[PDB]
Design a protein around this ligand. Structure first.
Ligand SMILES: [Mg+2]
Ligand SMILES: [Zn+2]
Ligand SMILES: [Zn+2]
Ligand SMILES: [Zn+2]
Lengths: 36, 159, 146, 84, 773, 188, 65, 114, 133, 263
């Protein structure tokens, strides 16, 4: 699951590392599957 | 509304007039209502114009409509183009949509983009029902190593 | 009496206040916290710049030399920005900056910087302006259940 | 299904697609060391050359214009007026 | 099938584009490395062995080189690994797949390709670095910018294929597109900005610079124009030399709001014999407009000469701009102290009205509009007050902007900028909105937890009173965020839904073409249009012209076209005509004139039955107005001596011409009518322009100038007919679908949503409506 | 590797406006200040209005200040920092308050008629550089040619080009066909 | 990563001043603005060079091998 | 990768000559010299000098593209005065002038204290 | 080898509408109330102001490429100070007993009102405008 | 004493303020460009690396080494490798230095440009010598070593010119100006109310007479007198840049005269 991201999808991703802030920004991220 | 109209002296004159704009439609029953000029009555539902005034009217409507969409953006486009659209969309006596109607066709052949990778079951079936391919499509002629009968290839050169 | 040069704010018509914001700039996230004067900026532009910060180079860890990962871009000479944010301090931005304080000039010069292209000082590219290191790394193993 | 040299209703002029396919073909032949029917004013390029042979109505080719019904008309490059 | 989708792409390349002011409109810069890679199979020949042999010698890795050599027997000699690379005695018949060289025709395109203009053909020009380079003016047909876009280079592989590119889709041959029915490319950015500056009356150029400019124009004839000023110091006007760039015999007239053959404001535009006489040269004259210098030059001097026109202009104007510079800072976004004051109150009183209208509603004195809610008509009124506040605050700001203000300068030239920008930057930003309403109460009965419930004031529901220069407040920053976001969400949609439509339209018409019977059918042979566009014409040879005959009073109509030889007063004063004195009374001639005048009247009636508007300006082939000015100075006609023109020459000349226009040639009853039809409107224009009085009293033509004009019109008319083969099916589709991929926004469905509604023939439309008269 | 700024490379300030390099000039060609300062970057004034990207302008003005005085410029959002106050500080430093500066043309040495917004701004260096995207396939004996570019070519009416592209160079073969039953049953 | 040797924009050698600089600050308790001017860094191009520098080589050194 | 060697700005390649003199066609007594491996330094300088000669009817220069360190110079002179000679004079003058400047500057420098 | 117009004018107005170097001079001739002039001048190389009595001449003389010095000691149609060159474009019936004239000098405009000129004013390009004192 | 004349306002080991009068803007300008890019100088242009346990990469270090200024007064007699007949380099077209530094103490070892050691025969000519204008004498900080990190290098410096690479730049930054009062009118000042009050004033104004309220524009005046000030990185004496710069530009124009000859 943690390797793939397919619980049972998109969860779990390779931590961003181009810039220090881009990494912070990645750990602070959110996602919404699928009326406004 | 304003309305350039001819003057008895000849010049066009801005002769303002009262018009009612409606938020709902019932063309059939409003033309009849007395007090209105049943000649100039209009709707932006070309589908209703067609049903009440005939496809030729519908064609004009459909154009008048397509026009406004573009015009409303300040844009302009030559009549010949939208006209052609409006015609294709009409030649069959009724209003035909183009945002893909059929799941198979619109105006193609049994070879262009042989999709489905079933050029297998398609060829078997094409043999069954003696199919006659016109070969006027670019990619069908590709498979024959020919130019399609378009622009540059719409005529033969000879000795 | 009121400094004209300052933005116009409404008032405090309230005697029912239950709470008070620690600070309003705390409504931005990591990305946005790095934008200078995002409040004097058109709405969307801030969303573009938020996305691009991620496409930027610079030190991302003071231990890049000891790490072995598919690609890593380090900026030869990172530089803390002259214009900053009271929020950049917690995002340790001045420590691991991305970016460099370039001496810009807004002008029509040779016609070589239209439709978003820039004219860049060659002589400075030489003295080190914007050079970066690029580190790619491949990897392999041996057989399986054979 | 053929149409006599008289009764031809098609255009007297050469369309750009026709003048474009002729120069093409001709140019090709020239590139293939073919007999040239013009006096080069010192021109080296084949296309360039074909434009000149077209210019001097010296191209023995005939354009067969097909109507959508199936019938056709044959016009000799030579006749076709070349304005454009 | 993997080949039909162009998967296996051979002889192509792709990289980042970057503009170049020194490349010609029709070139494309190719990085040397890419050129060494893309090849062309060239057969050996008595006229190229020298060259071809040198390329083979240069080898696979020295630019004007080559890779593989192919012999008679289809053998493939690889010039990189071959014991006989330093040999090879090339032979007539063999093929040398050379490297790509300068001037080779190549297909260049940017995706998505929704045009023809998005896939044009350029002449190669091998260059050093690694980006494809192109002339800025080619920017919009492709719809490209330089923030990193990539583009594709394709290389024709046959001698036939090459010609097909150079002769059909070359960049100059596309300058005037058949979609907008006008020029597809104009002058932009720096060049547009500089051409305005360079053109002010105030602008002067002295010898040192005049000479460097003159030389920068390649087609220059080394003839220094005489200074406009020769007094204490010989000085040249910016217009003076920019005219060097303009070819001779190009005539243009403008006339903006207050223009007057004396343009006190330097309004309008007046070019005669390729010499600018008055008017600041900005977007209207040199942009991609309908009557523009470009549209014209193309139709008058040819596409290749127009191609160079972009070049020559961008060379002088861009050189001039280099040594003058242009810039932009904050100073430019600052308004005068008093102006900010007049703005801070303009808003303050705007809030008042909002306040009053609220108290009025809170007292229940508001009377709802028809069909609307007390609530709806309140919002309606309040929104109107705020947009109105935003606009007048803006014009206030826009007004102080000096002629120095760099932003105003970019707005005046027409290269970026607009009221809305200056307004939002310098003065008030505006009312934020979402779903065509002010900020809703996402929280219960309120906007943000920093307000009290049931608060409908402007501050509360989305008004941003500040400017970008002043800065937004937190509450302002968030609403704006909410709006700008909606702008991002549908922009994403409008992008998709359109790309859909565009592809879907091409599917329906992709098979329609114009056949040799001048008809328009599909692959089944079914008739869609008995004559293309109903007139057999080709959109690019059409221009907007005004049919004088429709307009005016019946009186002016008569003072203008009426000729009555049998009547002292209303006849041809003998000053106009040679046989004018001895024509006074010719019975047999009156019959002709009467039959003429009759026809003109029948027409006036016809045009008023077609165009009920009274509207006179419509696109039709052949710009007659021009052909005439092209007779005024081509034969040097003096409006002093009478004409040697016979009343028959005219009447019968104009009458025969019409027998020749011809779009159809069928020698039978039906077709002969079609022919008459397809030409009806155009003749109306013809007859109205070449009417006897006009040709004598309006533009004193001579039997030769006139005989020339006639001859000319016939020619131009025949070049304007559509060529059998034109794939108008695609043209049409692409022509509606591309201008639809630029739309991105009084209560009715418009834009892509509406278009999708229409094209899908949806019976459940969102904004029905009946319009009764 | 060590990647050095090349003509096609990508750069951007922090106001949502990226932009590749379109050429590089040496200090002698670059426009120069009277003090001798010369730019590192030169962006086009034409990229400001339509953007409403005013923060960029402020940041720059504010930065000219910080550098000139060794201070750190506070560009936080909701502060009372004004363009006016910053201009006051800049002016004390002897420079014209809005950031403008008289500059000279590098080729000629003559003055530039317009003064130019000159100062430092923070610019970032974006990845994905040109020498990573130059790909050029040739194998004689996006970048794909899809339905979309095919349509454009049909519009142009380049019939024979479409044949040469979409086809697979498999050397045309010659066959004899019967005119009554289209099968290759002809003994030649 | 180390003081640039030479300022980008003009080339005034700015590599021999890091330490001097950091000293005019610490012990001489000067404001950055005065320190710079005394290191002879008069134009802002040269100033931004030192002022803006982040000496990362210092944390780079802290890793054992 | 597709970048030429820096030394190509000043060092002449193979078969290239500092100068190429083609006779102008448009106007009479006009010439177009092509300077290889030279930029504005020499270009704008000589057009300046050449423009002091009242027998020089036309004189300008251009660098058609900044990628190539080269430039053209056109010179028209009055009838009977070879443009080549016009160039020779300007060049001498440009030198005698720099002769004086180098001299005067050193002088002045020798009186300075510090 | 001619002179086409001579007369002295009394400038009544001098307008500078955002032009830091050019102004619009609208002077009324001396003698004939009929004759009136409208002109654009470079108030930078040749100043002008309230009720000045400027002299004006037209002619077409002292088009092949332009030359500068030498003649400095040869021809001197410099008996004037301000001097322009331009092309003429059209004559308009100002209706009645007066016919006008529009002149364009690379942008600097000029309108002249009178009548005897029909014989004194060219019908072509050439046309210099000279002004003195 | 002829055309171009000089007036020096200040002088030193690094700066020289002077006034050039009786010279066209052109010459004043070229002379300036030449200094900035066409004066020979010696600079490390080759670096061989034996050991690098430093925390910096090889090309990083190398780039800085090429940047370290080196004496160049006698370069006019050192040769361009590309012109020397040797195979690569030699004491006739180069100067070889060596840099060996080892993190000895545990207090962080600093490496300076003074640790460079010339190993080729300088043949008695003053050239190649890390230049140093520091107070403590450490001409530029090359690198920093920790506990026991090494760094063995051999550098070969070659005669070069800015055009090839900015490192061969001996001119730092030139101050240029002319017509401190906009008398000449080569600029249109951007104002907001009062141009003259908004745009500061140049110290050069002090050295020229104001414009006087009602004087008409002097359309015949051209650009004379230029107020410059040449900085110097050290590799060459201030006064030298000016001279050699004038020399170079002088030799250039000379070459065109020779060219027309051979022709
Ligand atoms: Mg883009
Ligand atoms: Zn058979
Ligand atoms: Zn510096
Ligand atoms: Zn050697």
């Amino acid at each position: 699951a943690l390797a793939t991201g397919n619980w049972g999808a998109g969860v779990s991703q390779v931590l961003n590392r181009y810039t220090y802030s881009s990494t912070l920004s990645h750990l602070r991220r959110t996602n919404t599957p699928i009326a406004k | 509304y304003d309305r350039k109209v001819p003057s008895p002296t000849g010049e066009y004159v801005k002769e303002p007039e009262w018009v009612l704009e409606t938020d709902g439609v019932n063309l059939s029953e409003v033309m009849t209502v007395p007090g209105i000029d049943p000649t100039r009555i209009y709707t932006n539902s070309f589908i209703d114009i067609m049903e009440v005034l005939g496809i030729e009217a519908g064609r004009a409507a459909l154009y008048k409509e397509v026009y406004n969409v573009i015009a409303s953006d300040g844009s302009y486009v030559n009549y010949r183009h939208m006209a052609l659209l409006v015609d294709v969309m009409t030649t069959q006596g009724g209003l035909t949509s183009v945002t893909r109607h059929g799941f198979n066709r619109s105006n193609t052949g049994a070879l262009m983009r042989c999709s489905f990778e079933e050029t297998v079951e398609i060829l078997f079936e094409a043999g069954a029902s003696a199919e006659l391919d016109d070969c006027r499509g670019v990619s069908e002629n590709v498979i024959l190593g020919q130019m399609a009968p378009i622009g540059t290839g719409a005529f033969d050169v000879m000795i | 009496d009121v400094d004209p040069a300052k933005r116009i704010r409404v008032s405090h018509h309230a005697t029912t206040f239950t709470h008070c914001e620690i600070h309003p700039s705390m409504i931005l996230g990591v990305a946005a916290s790095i934008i200078p004067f995002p409040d004097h900026n058109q709405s969307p532009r801030n969303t573009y710049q938020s996305a691009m910060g991620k496409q930027a180079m610079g030190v991302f860890l003071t231990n890049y030399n000891v790490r072995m990962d598919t690609m890593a871009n380090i900026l030869y000479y990172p530089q803390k920005p002259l214009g900053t944010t009271r929020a950049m301090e917690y995002l340790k931005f001045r420590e691991l900056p991305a970016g460099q304080n370039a001496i810009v000039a807004i002008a029509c010069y040779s016609g070589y910087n239209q439709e978003d292209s820039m004219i860049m000082n060659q002589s400075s590219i030489d003295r080190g302006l914007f050079r970066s290191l690029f580190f790619r790394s491949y990897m392999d193993q041996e057989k399986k259940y054979g | 299904k053929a149409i006599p040299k008289d009764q031809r209703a098609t255009t007297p002029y050469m369309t750009k697609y026709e003048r474009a396919r002729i120069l093409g073909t001709r140019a090709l032949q020239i590139s293939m060391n073919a007999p040239v029917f013009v006096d080069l004013e010192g021109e080296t390029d084949p296309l360039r050359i074909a434009m000149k042979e077209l210019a001097e109505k010296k191209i023995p080719l005939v354009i067969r214009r097909y109507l959508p019904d199936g019938s056709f008309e044959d016009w000799s490059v030579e006749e076709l007026i070349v304005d454009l | 099938r993997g080949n039909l989708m162009g998967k296996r792409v051979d002889f192509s390349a792709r990289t980042v584009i970057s503009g170049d002011p020194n490349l010609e409109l029709d070139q494309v810069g190719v990085p040397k490395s890419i050129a060494k890679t893309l090849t062309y199979p060239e057969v050996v020949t008595p006229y190229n062995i020298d060259r071809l042999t040198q390329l083979v010698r240069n080898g696979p890795n020295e630019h004007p080189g080559a890779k593989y050599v192919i012999r008679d027997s289809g053998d493939r000699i690889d010039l990189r690994y071959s014991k006989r690379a330093g040999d090879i005695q090339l032979q007539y018949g063999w093929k040398v797949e050379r490297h790509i060289m300068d001037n080779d025709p190549v297909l260049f395109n940017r995706q998505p390709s929704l045009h023809k203009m998005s896939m044009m053909a350029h002449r190669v020009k091998v260059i050093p670095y690694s980006t494809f380079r192109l002339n800025l003016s080619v920017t919009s047909p492709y719809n490209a910018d330089f923030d990193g876009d990539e583009m594709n280079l394709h290389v024709p592989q046959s001698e036939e294929t090459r010609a097909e590119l150079s002769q059909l889709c070359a960049v100059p041959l596309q300058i005037v597109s058949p979609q907008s029915n006008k020029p597809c490319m104009g002058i932009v950015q720096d060049t547009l900005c500089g051409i305005r500056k360079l053109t002010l009356r105030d602008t002067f150029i002295e010898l040192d610079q005049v000479l460097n400019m003159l030389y920068w124009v390649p087609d220059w004839d080394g003839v220094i124009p005489t200074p406009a000023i020769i007094k204490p110091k010989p000085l040249w006007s910016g217009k003076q030399i920019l005219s060097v760039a303009i070819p001779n015999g190009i005539h243009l007239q403008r006339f903006d709001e207050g223009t007057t053959l004396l343009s006190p404001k330097d309004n309008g535009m007046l070019i005669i014999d390729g010499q600018i006489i008055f008017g600041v040269v900005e977007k209207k004259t040199v942009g991609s407009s309908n009557g523009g210098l470009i549209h014209v030059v193309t139709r008058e001097k040819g596409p290749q000469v127009c191609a160079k026109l972009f070049g020559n202009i961008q060379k002088v104007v861009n050189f001039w701009l280099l040594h003058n510079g242009f810039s932009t800072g904050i100073g430019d976004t600052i308004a005068d102290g008093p102006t900010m004051r007049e703005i801070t109150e303009t808003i303050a009183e705007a809030k008042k009205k909002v306040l009053d209208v609220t108290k009025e509603a809170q007292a229940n004195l508001l009377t709802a509009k028809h069909g609307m809610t007390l609530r709806e008509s309140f919002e309606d009124n309040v929104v109107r007050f705020l947009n109105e506040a935003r606009d007048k605050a803006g014009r206030l700001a826009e007004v102080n902007l000096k002629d120095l203000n760099n932003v105003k300068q970019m707005v005046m030239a027409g290269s970026k900028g607009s009221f809305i920008n200056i307004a939002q930057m310098s003065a008030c930003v505006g009312q934020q909105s979402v779903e065509g309403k002010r900020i809703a109460f996402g929280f219960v009965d309120r906007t943000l937890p920093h307000f009290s419930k049931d608060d409908y004031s402007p501050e509360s529901k989305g008004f941003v009173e500040n400017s970008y220069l002043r800065g937004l407040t937190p509450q302002e920053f968030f609403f704006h965020a909410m709006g700008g976001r909606e702008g991002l969400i549908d922009t994403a949609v409008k992008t998709a839904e359109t790309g859909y439509i565009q592809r879907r339209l091409v599917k329906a018409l992709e098979d329609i073409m114009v056949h040799y019977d001048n008809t328009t059918r599909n692959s089944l042979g079914n008739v869609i249009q008995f004559i293309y566009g109903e007139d057999g014409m080709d959109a690019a040879h059409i221009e907007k012209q005004s049919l004088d005959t429709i307009g005016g009073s019946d009186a002016a109509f008569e003072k203008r076209y009426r000729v009555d030889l049998l009547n002292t007063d209303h006849t041809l004063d003998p000053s106009l005509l040679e046989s004018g004195s001895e024509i006074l009374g010719d019975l047999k001639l009156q019959v002709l004139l009467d039959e003429e005048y009759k026809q003109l009247v029948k027409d006036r009636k016809f045009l008023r039955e077609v165009f009920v508007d009274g509207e006179a300006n419509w696109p039709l082939p052949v710009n007659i107005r021009r052909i005439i000015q092209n007779a005024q100075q081509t034969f040097h006609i003096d409006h002093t001596k009478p004409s040697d023109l016979t009343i028959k020459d005219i009447v019968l000349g104009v009458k025969d011409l019409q027998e020749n226009l011809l779009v159809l040639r069928g020698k039978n009853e039906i077709i002969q009518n079609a022919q008459r039809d397809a030409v009806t409107l155009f003749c109306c224009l013809l007859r109205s322009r070449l009417a006897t009085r006009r040709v004598l009293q309006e533009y004193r033509l001579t039997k030769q100038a006139f005989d020339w004009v006639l001859s000319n019109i016939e020619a131009q008319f025949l070049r304007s007919v559509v060529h059998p083969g034109e794939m108008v099916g695609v043209l049409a589709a692409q022509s509606i679908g591309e201008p639809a991929t630029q739309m991105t926004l009084k209560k009715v469905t418009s834009g892509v949503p509406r278009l999708k509604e229409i094209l899908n023939v949806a019976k459940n439309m969102k904004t029905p409506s009946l319009t009764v008269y | 590797t060590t990647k050095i700024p090349q003509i096609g490379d990508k750069f951007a300030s922090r106001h949502g406006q990226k932009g590749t390099i379109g050429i590089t000039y040496r200090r002698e060609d670059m426009p120069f200040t009277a003090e001798g300062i010369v730019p590192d970057l030169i962006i086009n004034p034409h990229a400001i209005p339509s953007r409403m990207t005013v923060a960029h302008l402020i940041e720059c003005l504010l930065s000219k200040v910080a550098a000139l005085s060794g201070n750190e410029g506070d560009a936080s959002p909701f502060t009372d920092i004004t363009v006016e106050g910053i201009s006051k500080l800049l002016r004390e430093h002897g420079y014209q308050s809005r950031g403008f500066e008289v500059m000279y043309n590098g080729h000629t040495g003559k003055k530039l008629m317009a003064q130019i917004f000159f100062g430092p701004t923070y610019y970032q260096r974006l990845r994905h550089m040109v020498d990573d995207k130059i790909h050029a396939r040739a194998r004689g004996p996006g970048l794909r040619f899809g339905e979309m570019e095919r349509d454009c070519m049909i519009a142009h009416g380049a019939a024979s080009f479409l044949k040469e592209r979409l086809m697979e160079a498999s050397d045309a073969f010659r066959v004899h066909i019967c005119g009554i039953c289209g099968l290759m049953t002809v003994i030649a | 990563m180390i003081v640039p040797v030479r300022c980008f924009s003009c080339g005034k050698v700015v590599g021999d001043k890091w330490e001097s600089y950091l000293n005019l600050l610490q012990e001489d308790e000067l404001d950055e603005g005065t320190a710079l001017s005394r290191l002879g860094l008069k134009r802002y191009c040269c100033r931004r060079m030192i002022l803006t520098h982040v000496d990362l080589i210092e944390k780079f050194l802290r890793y054992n091998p | 990768m597709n970048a030429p060697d820096r030394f190509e700005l000043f060092l002449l390649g193979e078969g290239e000559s500092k100068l190429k003199i083609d006779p102008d066609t448009k106007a009479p007594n006009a010439v177009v010299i092509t300077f290889e491996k030279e930029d504005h330094t020499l270009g704008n300088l000589i057009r300046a000098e050449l423009l002091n000669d009242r027998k020089v009817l036309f004189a300008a220069y251009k660098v058609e593209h900044p990628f190539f360190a080269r430039f053209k110079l056109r010179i028209q002179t009055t009838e009977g005065y070879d443009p080549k000679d016009a160039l020779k004079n300007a060049c001498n003058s440009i030198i005698n002038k720099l002769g004086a400047l180098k001299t005067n500057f050193e002088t002045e420098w020798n009186l300075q204290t510090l | 080898s001619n002179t086409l117009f001579d007369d002295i004018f009394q400038v009544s107005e001098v307008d500078p509408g955002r032009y830091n170097k050019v102004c619009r001079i609208e002077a009324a001739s001396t003698t004939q109330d009929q004759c009136k002039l409208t002109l654009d001048i470079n108030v930078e190389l040749f100043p002008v102001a309230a009720q000045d009595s400027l002299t004006v001449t037209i002619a077409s003389s002292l088009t092949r490429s332009w030359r500068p010095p030498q003649a400095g000691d040869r021809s001197l149609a410099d008996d004037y100070d301000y001097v322009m060159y331009g092309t003429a474009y059209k004559f308009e019936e100002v209706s009645k007993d007066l016919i006008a004239v529009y002149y364009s000098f690379g942008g600097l405009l000029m309108r002249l009102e009178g009548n005897y000129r029909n014989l004194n004013n060219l019908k072509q390009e050439n046309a210099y405008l000279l002004i003195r004192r | 004493e002829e055309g171009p004349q000089v007036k020096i306002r200040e002088a030193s080991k690094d700066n020289v303020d002077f006034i050039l009068s009786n010279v066209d803007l052109a010459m004043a300008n070229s002379l300036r460009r030449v200094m900035i890019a066409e004066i020979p100088t010696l600079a490390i242009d080759s670096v061989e690396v034996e050991t690098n346990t430093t925390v910096l990469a090889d090309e990083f270090i190398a780039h800085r080494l090429g940047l370290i200024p080196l004496q160049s007064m006698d370069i006019e007699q050192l040769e361009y490798s590309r012109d020397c007949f040797c195979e690569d380099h030699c004491d006739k077209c180069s100067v070889v230095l060596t840099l060996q530094a080892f993190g000895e103490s545990e207090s962080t070892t600093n490496v300076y440009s003074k640790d460079l050691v010339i190993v080729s025969n300088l043949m008695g000519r003053n050239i190649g010598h890390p230049i140093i204008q520091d107070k403590e004498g450490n001409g530029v900080l090359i690198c920093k070593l920790r506990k026991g990190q090494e760094l063995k290098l051999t550098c070969v410096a070659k005669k070069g010119i800015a055009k090839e690479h900015a490192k061969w730049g001996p001119a730092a930054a030139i101050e240029f100006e002319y017509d401190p009062w906009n008398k000449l009118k080569h600029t249109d000042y951007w104002y907001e109310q009062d141009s003259a009050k908004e745009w500061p004033q140049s110290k050069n104004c002090e050295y020229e007479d104001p414009p006087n309220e009602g004087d008409p524009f002097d359309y015949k005046a051209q650009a004379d007198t230029f107020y410059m000030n040449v900085e110097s990185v050290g590799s060459i004496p201030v006064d030298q840049v000016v001279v050699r710069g004038i020399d170079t530009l002088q030799k250039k124009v000379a070459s065109i005269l020779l060219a027309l000859t051979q022709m």
